[PDB]
Design a protein around this ligand. Structure first.
Ligand SMILES: NC[C@@H]1O[C@H](O[C@H]2[C@@H](O)[C@H](O[C@@H]3[C@@H](O)[C@H](N)C[C@H](N)[C@H]3O[C@H]3O[C@H](CN)[C@@H](O)[C@H](O)[C@H]3N)O[C@@H]2CO)[C@H](N)[C@@H](O)[C@@H]1O
Ligand SMILES: Nc1ncnc2c1ncn2[C@@H]1O[C@H](COP(=O)(O)OP(=O)(O)O)[C@@H](O)[C@H]1O
Ligand SMILES: [Mg+2]
Ligand SMILES: [Mg+2]
Length: 263
């Protein structure tokens, strides 16, 4: 078994009214620390995932590295207590993108924000980026996640696409169709649930576990995925690409989409 938080962190959480999140489909625990002067956010991952891209210990390193680079939360407190990586952070600036256009019907504005993140990422210098997440490192991690049954291979939200009938089939296809990689700055989980906007621009990025070096089509692929499922009109997928000023590599896009199927 295990535990949770330390005494120190048990003080702050007591001082703020705590509310338990339910927006994190991940193995992490997320709590909002409602406060009088502000709100703080606590996120915790158990040992089983240490060293993995879910380990907040890593999300924290990356969160520290983006200071003065991208709009990310401020690392307040971090600790390893009872085989748990606990991160205390400040409340992202802005509104959740999913809740800024929740009613939606502002397709082009979403497409803009997505395309804005992309251009933005292709600005962060990865000369000193802490982690490299090339397919090699990622297929490595996946394999590992499967061997230790650390991944949900039964009840996930598959894409209606995934041509495969079992986990290893997919793994194999990935480990076998690896596109060439042009390393840029990758978020690792670009989606309206992990992005914050304000007054019309992006004002915050959170959920930075797989943040680091990675092919450029990785994030783009994700935006395509979201765009398609949430708007469902090839029309705005094209527009997205027009705003990016790039031609779609449907092979890479598909590929990278699949790579996320088991995470
Ligand atoms: N939070 C966004 C809200 O939830 C859905 O979006 C979610 C959904 O599309 C997408 O879920 C995708 C699936 O698709 C894809 N086929 C497999 C991939 N494992 C899964 O990933 C999801 O589960 C992971 C853990 N297994 C989490 O680590 C990750 O944060 C989350 N993106 O990620 C979004 C969560 O962020 C609604 N579609 C959207 O309209 C609504 O706004
Ligand atoms: N620093 C933060 N500021 C504001 N909201 C946050 C912050 N950290 C987490 N959240 C909220 O809680 C949810 C879960 O956080 P996230 O890191 O995305 O967990 P998971 O990796 O499970 O998706 C986010 O979608 C967001 O609603
Ligand atoms: Mg999230
Ligand atoms: Mg996550």
């Amino acid at each position: 078994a295990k535990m949770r938080i330390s005494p120190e962190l048990k003080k702050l959480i007591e001082k703020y009214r705590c509310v338990k999140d339910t927006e994190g489909m991940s193995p992490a625990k997320v709590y909002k620390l409602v406060g009088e002067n502000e709100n703080l956010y606590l996120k915790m991952t158990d040992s089983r995932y240490k060293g993995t891209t879910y380990d907040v210990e890593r999300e924290k390193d990356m969160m520290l590295w983006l200071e003065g680079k991208l709009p990310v939360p401020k690392v307040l407190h971090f600790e390893r207590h009872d085989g748990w990586s606990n991160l205390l952070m400040s409340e992202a600036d802005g509104v959740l993108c999913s809740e800024e256009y929740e009613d939606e019907q502002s397709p082009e504005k979403i497409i803009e924000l997505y395309a804005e993140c992309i251009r933005l990422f292709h600005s962060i210098d990865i000369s000193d980026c802490p982690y490299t997440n090339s397919l090699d490192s990622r297929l490595a991690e996946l394999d590992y996640l499967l061997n230790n049954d650390l991944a949900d291979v039964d009840c996930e939200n598959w894409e209606e696409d995934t041509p495969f009938k079992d986990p290893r089939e997919l793994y194999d296809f990935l480990k076998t169709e690896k596109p060439e990689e042009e390393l840029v700055f990758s978020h690792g989980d670009l989606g309206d649930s992990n992005i914050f906007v304000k007054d019309g621009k992006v004002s915050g990025f959170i959920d930075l576990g797989r943040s680091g070096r990675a092919d450029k089509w990785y994030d783009i692929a994700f935006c395509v995925r979201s765009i398609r499922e949430d708007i469902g009109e090839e029309q705005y997928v094209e527009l997205f690409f027009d705003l990016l000023g790039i031609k779609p590599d449907w092979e890479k896009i598909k590929y990278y989409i699949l790579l996320d199927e088991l995470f």
